[PDB]
Design a protein around this ligand. Structure first.
Ligand SMILES: [Ca+2]
Ligand SMILES: [Fe+3]
Ligand SMILES: [Mn+2]
Length: 409
């Protein structure tokens, strides 16, 4: 614990969706899987994760936070390998804190790939999670919630972390699928209040971290936490000005109001596994007692070159990733345009313009920045009603407020 009332350097990431290389042979089965993984660089999760941690190390980061979805599909092996990397990070002096996401625990979808077959592989239980990641928040927690993997951590004397587990997994094996939506019981909400009171007694500011979102981040369920108003009210009552969440994967900042009018800013950092692969820098000013959040794009090309890599996709990662993610949204739209009988009145060239607009607006929405003008926009505006159309339109306008920078008030 950092007792000195000095500036604190922090980094937050989320949705690493780590997949242990030992769980795949990069065969047919794996290729199809990654193809349907809508944009996530699953094939390079090991390199992306290492590149990221190398950055944390060079920054000599005080605190590293990971807001859920540590693994692809809760594979025990992926969890163990990721834990090994975090153990090394801690040897450098950096304190690491993690919480689970919807894909991390009791995951019936845990699979390993061999040729044209997906085979079963072990997942983990809730207590397995607190055991595997005991060094990263759990063992030294100041307080731990009774029925969730939530806990209160004190990495320094002036700044504490309210690490929340908003994941729902206790009925996963019975469902056959990992629950996507998130939520907090009244008991965990009561614990949050007690925790907030303890931080206040100790003169510490508190940063609430959760996988699911505190409020909506797109005008177009299961991503914003269930019954979010109760959570917002609980956090604002604790005097917390901002929260760090993930799950939706898009670099996106939005504010919400408590029932009594207090504001809290929900900062969603880009999924580490998806374009543009940004992570968040958070700096605490001891003198001003405020927090400054600034996103940073992971430089894979620089890491690749320093590794002496011969993989062209990594040496040219910017282009590779740009194309990979653009095509994911392009194909997404084109499939619909080529299936719905309400679009056959559009000629091929137009469907292409529309697919292009989706690929552009979509990728820039994930980057959290303004999308460039595209000929497909006019076509979408007059196109038939649909969720897709709503999304394309809702992401056609420039962000009215930065999704990359925030300073607490
Ligand atoms: Ca530790
Ligand atoms: Fe998630
Ligand atoms: Mn995720």
């Amino acid at each position: 614990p950092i007792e000195k009332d000095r500036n604190l350097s922090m980094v937050v990431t989320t949705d690493v969706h780590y997949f242990a290389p030992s769980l795949t042979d990069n065969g047919k089965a794996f290729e199809k899987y990654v193809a349907a993984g809508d944009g996530k660089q699953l094939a390079y999760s090991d390199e992306i994760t290492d590149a990221f941690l190398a950055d944390v190390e060079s920054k000599k980061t005080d605190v590293l936070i990971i807001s859920g979805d540590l693994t692809n599909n809760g594979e025990k092996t992926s969890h163990e390998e990721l834990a090994k990397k975090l153990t090394q990070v801690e040897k450098n002096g950096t304190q690491v804190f993690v919480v689970p996401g919807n894909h991390d625990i009791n995951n019936p979808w845990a699979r390993k790939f061999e040729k044209d077959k997906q085979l079963p592989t072990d997942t983990i239980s809730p207590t397995d999670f607190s055991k595997i990641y005991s060094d990263f928040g759990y063992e030294d927690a100041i307080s731990s919630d009774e029925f969730s993997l939530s806990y209160l951590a004190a990495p320094s004397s002036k700044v504490w972390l309210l690490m929340l587990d908003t994941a729902i997994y206790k009925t996963n094996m019975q469902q056959g699928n990992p629950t996507t939506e998130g939520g907090l019981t009244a008991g965990t909400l009561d614990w949050i209040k007690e925790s907030s009171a303890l931080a206040k007694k100790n003169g510490a500011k508190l940063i609430p971290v959760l996988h699911h979102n505190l409020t909506d981040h797109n005008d177009v369920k299961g991503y914003t936490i269930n019954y979010n108003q109760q959570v917002i009210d609980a956090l604002t009552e604790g005097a917390m000005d901002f929260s760090l969440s993930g799950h939706i994967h898009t670099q996106n900042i939005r504010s919400a109001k408590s029932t009594d009018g207090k504001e809290i800013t929900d900062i969603v950092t880009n999924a580490l596994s998806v374009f543009p692969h940004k992570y968040g820098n958070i700096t605490y000013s001891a003198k001003n007692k405020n927090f400054t959040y600034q996103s940073q794009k992971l430089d894979m090309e620089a890491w690749a070159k320093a590794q002496g890599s011969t993989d062209e996709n990594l040496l040219n990662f910017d282009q590779f990733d740009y194309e990979t993610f653009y095509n994911s949204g392009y194909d997404k739209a084109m499939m619909d345009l080529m299936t719905d009988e309400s679009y056959d009145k559009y000629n091929q060239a137009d469907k292409e313009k529309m697919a292009d607009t989706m690929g552009l607006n979509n990728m820039y929405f994930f980057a959290g920045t303004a999308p460039p003008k595209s000929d497909g926009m006019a076509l979408w505006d007059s196109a038939p009603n649909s969720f897709l159309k709503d999304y394309v339109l809702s992401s056609s306008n420039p962000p009215k407020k930065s999704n990359d920078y925030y300073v607490s008030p």
